[PDB]
Design a protein around this motif. Structure first.
Motif, PDB file in Angstrom:
ATOM      1  N   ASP A   1       0.818  -1.209   0.000  1.00 35.93           N
ATOM      2  CA  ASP A   1       0.000   0.000   0.000  1.00 35.93           C
ATOM      3  C   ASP A   1       0.851   1.258   0.000  1.00 35.93           C
ATOM      4  O   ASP A   1       0.579   2.186   0.763  1.00 35.93           O
ATOM      5  CB  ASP A   1      -0.933  -0.006   1.203  1.00 35.93           C
ATOM      6  CG  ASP A   1      -2.005  -1.072   1.110  1.00 35.93           C
ATOM      7  OD1 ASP A   1      -2.420  -1.395  -0.025  1.00 35.93           O
ATOM      8  OD2 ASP A   1      -2.434  -1.578   2.178  1.00 35.93           O
TER       9      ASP A   1
ATOM     10  N   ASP B   1      -3.568   5.849  -1.582  1.00 39.72           N
ATOM     11  CA  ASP B   1      -3.631   4.710  -2.488  1.00 39.72           C
ATOM     12  C   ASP B   1      -5.043   4.544  -3.051  1.00 39.72           C
ATOM     13  O   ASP B   1      -6.029   5.019  -2.481  1.00 39.72           O
ATOM     14  CB  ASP B   1      -3.205   3.434  -1.760  1.00 39.72           C
ATOM     15  CG  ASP B   1      -2.666   2.373  -2.709  1.00 39.72           C
ATOM     16  OD1 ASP B   1      -2.517   2.660  -3.921  1.00 39.72           O
ATOM     17  OD2 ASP B   1      -2.387   1.256  -2.236  1.00 39.72           O
TER      18      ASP B   1
ATOM     19  N   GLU C   1      -8.890   3.034   1.624  1.00 38.38           N
ATOM     20  CA  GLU C   1      -8.628   3.337   0.219  1.00 38.38           C
ATOM     21  C   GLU C   1      -9.945   3.455  -0.525  1.00 38.38           C
ATOM     22  O   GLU C   1     -10.816   2.584  -0.398  1.00 38.38           O
ATOM     23  CB  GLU C   1      -7.762   2.262  -0.441  1.00 38.38           C
ATOM     24  CG  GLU C   1      -6.411   2.071   0.229  1.00 38.38           C
ATOM     25  CD  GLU C   1      -5.538   1.080  -0.520  1.00 38.38           C
ATOM     26  OE1 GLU C   1      -4.774   0.356   0.153  1.00 38.38           O
ATOM     27  OE2 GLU C   1      -5.623   1.037  -1.779  1.00 38.38           O
TER      28      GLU C   1
HETATM   29 CA   LIG Z   1      -3.769  -0.602  -1.829  1.00 43.82          CA
END
Ligand SMILES: [Ca+2]
Ligand SMILES: [Ca+2]
Ligand SMILES: [Ca+2]
Ligand SMILES: [Cl-]
Ligand code: NA
Ligand code: NA
Ligand code: NA
Ligand code: NA
Lengths: 4, 473
Positions: free
Chosen positions: B150, B193, B223
């Motif tokens: 990530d 992200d 996210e």
């Molecule tokens: Ca990710």
């Protein structure tokens, strides 16, 4: 790459 | 008549039941008689403490393997840092034993629970494939609280063996009904992200699950992306409660956190749902999640109503899972029609991206053909493009019903010059819409820099059916  | 669990930490499991309605409505499913009996869930992670006081009664060696060491026993490797506690925490969320004076209870506290030890080592394509394809006629539901880094720069997905495992699983797993793959959408919120840059969550074969804090907010680690399907509660700030589960060394923890906690809770709820109707296919399950999930009291700045009247957010998908509503709807569910796939090659020539590119295309969605789609499920925009700084791109896809999906938001840390190589950006936000008509793809440079690149391929891939619609919400 692979992460927890 | 139904008596709720008496476990000592069950009163701290605010996300299973409360008077506040800030819960997953799991007790309502328990009272209908669904606690997971006969359903088998496997945690793909760093191992499972199979002798844990709150897992032993439900542990299933047939749902377990150790791929890192190539043996049947998924026991975690004990270290001083307790690095390998992660899978045991996930397992207790699904299926911790109820009414035994220990810790709390799993969502599906009478389900059988196993673990695949596969993260404690080099996680190759073959490792993932052997884990995803483990005992697919015994395991019903696979839960994965892991994925690519990530860092907000990576674009990565399953390689060939893993992708083959997904397809074999949904095609032949579970007696042909299809393995259920539940995925955590990711912890890269602080890095800005996007879970559409993650091919595991972005896959149509996985139910990607996001998180909400106790007070109904988008957690710091969350996210946003269009591929997320739904949400379960997890951790937030230090005034908000956290997840109660089994910990390594036979302990109980009240501080399990992050995206990792959300997927196991969804996996437990799906286990309850399969108990209520064992004949549900993998696509049936996603339909149930779409129809029953609840936006209410989840705070986000991007809630939008799609073409069939359902509210959808890139932070939450269709909202919070509702276990009571899932098991109620599952019981008399009519199996969806076979999945159709309509492939539409959009471009006739490459297009310079420049500061902004808009591609409009009116489609018939395979009118007159056996793959004609009037009821969308997943939609993919498979894009091939070059660009000098990938993270400056934002990409949106607008359906004919006017539903604007963010396929890609700006990623400040993604400096890559590699572009995208037939990357299948996926959106769930147009589920059940008619896909006939004008689709619009928008690619824009969100920075002030003089960036440059070329879009060379845009394949619109539609999945769905041509029958069975509900009156819009
Ligand atoms: Ca990710
Ligand atoms: Ca072992
Ligand atoms: Ca217990
Ligand atoms: Cl396909
Ligand atoms: Na099948
Ligand atoms: Na997915
Ligand atoms: Na239309
Ligand atoms: Na239009």
């Amino acid at each position: 790459x692979r992460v927890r | 008549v139904y008596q709720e669990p008496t476990d000592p930490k069950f009163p701290q499991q605010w996300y299973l039941s409360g008077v506040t309605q800030r819960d997953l409505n799991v007790k309502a499913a328990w009272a209908q008689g669904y606690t997971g009996h006969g359903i088998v869930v496997s945690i793909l992670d760093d191992g499972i403490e199979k002798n844990h006081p709150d897992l032993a009664g439900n542990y299933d060696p047939g749902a377990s393997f150790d791929v890192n060491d190539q043996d049947p026993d998924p026991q975690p490797r004990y270290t001083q840092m307790n690095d390998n506690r992660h899978g045991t925490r996930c397992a207790g969320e699904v299926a911790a034993v109820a009414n035994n004076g220990v810790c709390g209870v799993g969502v599906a506290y009478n389900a059988r629970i196993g673990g695949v030890r596969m993260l404690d080592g080099e996680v190759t394509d073959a490792v993932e494939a052997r884990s995803l394809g483990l005992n697919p006629n015994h395991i019903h539901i696979y839960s994965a609280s892991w994925g690519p880094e990530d860092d907000g720069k990576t674009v990565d997905g399953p390689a060939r063996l893993a992708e083959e495992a997904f397809f074999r699983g949904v095609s032949q797993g579970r007696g042909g009904l299809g393995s259920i793959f539940v995925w955590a959408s990711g912890n890269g919120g602080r890095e800005h992200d996007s879970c559409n840059c993650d091919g595991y969550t972005n896959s149509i074969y996985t139910l990607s699950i996001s998180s909400a804090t106790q007070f109904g907010n988008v957690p710091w680690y969350s996210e946003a992306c269009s591929s997320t399907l739904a949400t379960t509660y997890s951790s937030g700030n230090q005034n908000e409660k956290q997840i109660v589960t089994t910990d390594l060394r036979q302990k109980c923890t009240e501080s399990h956190t992050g995206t990792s906690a959300s997927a196991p809770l969804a996996a437990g709820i799906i286990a309850l749902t399969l108990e209520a109707n064992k004949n549900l296919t993998w696509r049936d399950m996603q339909h149930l999640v779409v129809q029953t999930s609840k936006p209410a009291h989840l705070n986000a700045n991007d809630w939008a109503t799609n073409g069939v009247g359902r509210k959808v957010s890139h932070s939450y998908g269709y909202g919070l899972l509702d276990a009571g509503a899932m098991v109620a709807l599952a019981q008399n569910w009519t199996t969806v029609a076979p999945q159709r796939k309509c492939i539409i090659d959009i471009l006739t020539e490459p297009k310079d991206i420049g500061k902004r590119l808009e591609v409009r295309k009116t489609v018939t969605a395979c009118l007159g053909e056996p793959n004609h789609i009037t009821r969308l499920e997943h939609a993919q925009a498979r894009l091939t493009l070059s660009y000098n700084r990938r993270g400056d791109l934002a990409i949106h896809l607008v359906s004919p019903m006017g539903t604007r999906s963010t396929l890609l938001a700006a990623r400040p840390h993604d400096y890559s010059a590699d572009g995208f190589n037939d990357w299948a950006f996926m959106t769930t936000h147009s589920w059940d819409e008619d896909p006939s008509g004008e689709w619009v793809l928008e690619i824009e440079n969100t920075s002030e820099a003089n960036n440059y690149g070329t879009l060379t391929k845009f394949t619109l891939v539609l999945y769905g059916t041509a029958s069975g619609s509900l009156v819009p919400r």
